[PDB]
């Protein structure tokens, strides 16, 4: 299968809905290769839990946790890890305020080669239990033969792009991973890397990251042919007093690039209330009343979470996806799975009269382009050459009574799936 795009397993749905899905235990299985060492980039970690996901035989192999924790939270993470002698930590520098290290990626070095996994799940039990999450699995990259002269690069330039991404951390522990990557052949890679890294990027450096990086790839490797843009995420930042400030101006502009209706999918209160988790799903859908009340204009773009196609309408989304379907939603010009939610922090925001792109966070995704497969478009796989879109199309608009899930206000008029109310505080 050319895509290697997978959803995580969801407990409590019919087996047919998990047949082609993966659990972290599957990803780390001996069947995937003989593990020597690994790196786990993420945001939240439950170390005891993480360790048990590795098979017993591999549990003592070295593990690098790359995170953005600071101060006490950092101390706590070090405390979680102390008992496991084989675990080292790398604190990603977060020199711009309010940034987070949000990238979810696994680097898995085996006796037989190297695997890169870019996905959407935090390393905690609940993210892999009853949520809809996405996974892209690289091929097993072989090591470059000890006497050849090859770049090991793919036509999408994934190898150099991933190295640049690691290089931006400027961390000694990652230099070791960069060196490992240099040693392998990633030429079979058919996706484009889209990363965000904290900084202020000017000149041509603007095209390296965030939504400009996406813009640049859509201009170079896609071509033009009322194809809407679909954006689907689990968090929402403060986007401005009105939409011309960022959403429609730079964000949509980048997304509509090729060689226009914008539909945003974000769970309503009702979607969360009736989920497999009930209201506690809302603990992973941050959207503060503080921010929401300043931008009620945004909510007219919102569409309900519906995933009958993958049996996951009740499995709340923590996956994030962006794509460009045709007017009848039967095909798509491209598809992106990433850790980036709907925020300036994640995607970047122009500064100094559009000469400088400011990004606060680390984010990472893979872009699927028909040109990389020799195609002009992908047909949408109706029931999860055809791309497996994990939610239903066309997107369904919020009803008049719907509200976007807002996590720091109470919902006490209707009980959820487990008969509970939600009272933050």
The DSSP secondary structure of 255-324, one letter per residue, reads HH-----EEEE--BHHHHHTSSS-GGGGGGS---HHHHHT-GGGGGGEE----GGGT-TTS-B--EEEEE
Please check whether residues 125 and 30 belong to one and the same domain: yes
Signed CA dihedral, 43, 49, 53, 54: sign only: positive
267's tokens = 């769970």
Domains in the chain, number: 2
What whole-number distance in Å separates Cα of residue 266 and Cα of residue 271?
9
Written as one string, the DSSP assignment of 227-251 is --EEEE-S-B----SSGGGTIIIII
Same domain flag for 141 and 217: no
How many whole angstroms separate alpha carbon 191 and alpha carbon 154? 9
- Using a 10 angstrom Cβ sphere, with 0-12 exposed, 13-18 middle and 19 or more buried, the burial of residue 332 is buried
Q: 217 and 175 in one domain?
A: no
- DSSP symbols for 182-231: HHB--TT--SEEEEE-SEEEEGGGGGGSHHHHHHHHHHHH-------EEE
Among 16, 27, 259, 249, which residue's Cα sits nearest to residue 135? 27
| Distance (Å, whole) CA 88 – CA 82 | 9
On whether both 138 and 196 belong to a single domain, the answer is no
Buried b (16+ CB within 10 A) or exposed e, 126-158: bbbbbbbbbbbbbbebebbeeeeeeebebebeb
Which residues have a catalytic role annotated? 102, 318
Q: Are residues 132 and 164 in the same domain?
A: yes
Alpha carbon distance 314, 110 (integer Å): 36
Query: Which structural domain range is residue 60 located in?
Result: 1-190
Q: How far apart are CA 393 and CA 308, in angstroms?
A: 10
| Whether 177 and 266 share a structural domain | no
CA distance 232 to 365: 13
Pair 377, 328: CB distance under 8 Å: no
Contact 339, 364 (CB under 8 A): yes
Method: X-ray
Which of 140, 158, 190 terminates a domain? The answer is: 190
Is the same domain home to 236 and 167? no
For residues 185 and 195, state if they share a domain: no
Q: Do 21 and 129 touch, CB atoms closer than 8 A?
A: no
Closest CA to 61 of 22, 30, 31: 30
Tokens of 112: 């037989």
What whole-number distance in Å separates Cα of residue 259 and Cα of residue 213? 14
- Which residues fall within 8 angstroms of residue 366, CB to CB, at 6 or more apart? 118, 136, 191, 192, 193, 194, 336, 337, 338
CB atoms within 10 A of CB 415: 14
Token pair, residue 11, equals: 């407990």
Judge if 398 and 376 occupy the same domain: yes
Using the 3D structure, point to which of 165, 190, 215 is the last residue of a domain: 190
Are the C-beta atoms of residues 132 and 319 closer than 8 Å to each other? yes
Resolution in A: 2.0
Question: Which CATH number is 405's domain given?
Answer: 3.30.870.10
SS3 152: coil
Chosen domain end from 172, 190, 208: 190
114 and 131 housed in the same domain: yes
- How far from 148 is each of 141, 152, 155, 218, CA to CA, in Å? 16, 10, 19, 34
- Judgement on whether residues 308 and 391 belong to the same structural domain of the protein: yes
**What are the distances in angstroms from CA 309 to CA 314, 380, 388?**
12, 11, 9
**Residue 394 Cα to chain centre, angstroms:** 22
> At how many degrees (to 10) do helices 172-183 and 158-167 cross?
170
Only one residue has tokens 């995937």, namely 32
For the chain, count helices (H), then strands (E): 10, 19
Q: 168 and 211 share a domain?
A: no
């Amino acid at each position: 299968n050319p895509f290697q795009f997978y959803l995580t397993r969801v407990s409590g749905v019919k087996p047919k809905y998990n047949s082609g899905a993966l659990h972290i235990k599957d990803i780390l299985s001996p069947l995937f290769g003989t593990l020597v060492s690994s790196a786990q980039f993420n945001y939240c970690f439950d170390v005891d839990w993480l360790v048990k996901q590795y098979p017993p035989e591999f549990r003592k192999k070295p593990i690098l946790l790359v995170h953005g924790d600071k101060r006490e939270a950092k101390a706590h993470l070090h405390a979680q890890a102390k008992p496991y002698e084989n675990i080292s930590l790398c604190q990603a520098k977060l020199d711009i305020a309010f940034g987070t290290h949000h990238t979810k990626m696994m680097l898995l070095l085996y006796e037989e080669g190297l695997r890169v996994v870019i996905h959407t799940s935090n390393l905690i039990h609940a993210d892999w239990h009853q949520k809809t999450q996405g996974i892209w699995l690289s091929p097993l990259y072989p090591r470059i033969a000890d006497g050849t002269h090859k770049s090991g690069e793919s036509p999408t330039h994934f190898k150099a792009n991933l190295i640049s991404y690691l290089t931006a951390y400027n961390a000694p522990s990652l230099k070791e991973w960069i060196d490992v990557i240099h040693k392998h052949d990633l030429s079979e890679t058919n996706v484009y890397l889209i990363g965000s890294t904290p900084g202020r990027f000017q000149g041509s450096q603007k095209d390296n990251w965030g939504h400009f990086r996406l813009k640049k790839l859509l201009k170079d490797h896609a071509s033009s042919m009322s194809w809407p843009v679909v954006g689907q995420f689990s968090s929402v930042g403060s986007l401005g007093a009105d939409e011309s400030k960022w959403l429609c101006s730079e964000f949509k502009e980048s997304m509509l690039t090729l060689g226009v209706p914008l539909y945003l999918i974000y769970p309503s209160v009702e979607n969360v209330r009736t989920s497999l988790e009930g209201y506690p799903a809302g603990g992973s859908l941050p959207y503060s009343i503080q921010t929401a009340e300043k931008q009620n204009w945004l909510h007219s773009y919102f569409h309900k979470w519906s995933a009958e196609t993958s049996g996951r309408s009740n499995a709340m989304p923590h996956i994030k996806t962006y794509m460009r379907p045709s007017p009848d939603f039967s095909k798509i010009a491209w598809f992106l799975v990433t850790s980036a939610n709907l925020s300036k922090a994640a995607w970047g925001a122009l500064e100094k009269n559009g000469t400088q792109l400011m990004i606060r966070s680390y984010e990472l995704g893979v872009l699927f382009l028909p040109s990389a497969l020799g195609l002009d478009s992908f047909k949408v796989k109706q029931k999860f050459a055809t791309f497996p879109v994990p939610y239903d199309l066309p997107p369904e608009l919020y009803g008049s009574k719907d509200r976007p899930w807002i996590w720091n206000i109470p919902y006490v008029k209707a009980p959820d799936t487990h008969g509970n109310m939600w009272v933050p505080s």
